[PDB]
């Protein structure tokens, strides 16, 4: 699974950013520093189930 789609959608749904002008490396660096964060306890309990 190439995770450019998740971070690309993440900048789609933020209604400000011109997402077609953010190329690969910034999307993938947001992937790099986004999976350092703990999941919210709601979605963590969902994933545990």
């Amino acid at each position: 699974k190439k995770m450019k789609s998740i971070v690309e959608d993440f900048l789609k749904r933020l209604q400000i950013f011109d997402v077609a002008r953010v190329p690969d490396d910034q999307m993938y660096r947001l992937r790099d520093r986004l999976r350092l964060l703990p999941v919210e306890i709601r979605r963590l309990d969902i994933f545990n189930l």
């Binding site: 699974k1 190439k2 995770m3 993938y28």
Partner: protein
């Protein structure tokens, strides 16, 4: 002058072989799907996905 004793000879060879010039059409050749291509260390090249 022609002497038949010093001129009759039994020549010896093989029977019906086949030479092959290409030598590499006999190798059937496939590849791992290139998203799963790995290096010498068995870690995947193009980690970035």
């Amino acid at each position: 002058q022609f002497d038949f004793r010093a001129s009759m000879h039994m020549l010896t060879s093989n029977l019906t072989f086949t030479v092959y010039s290409d030598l590499l059409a006999f190798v059937s050749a496939d590849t791992v799907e290139p998203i799963n291509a790995v290096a010498f260390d068995n870690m995947r090249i193009m980690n970035e996905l």
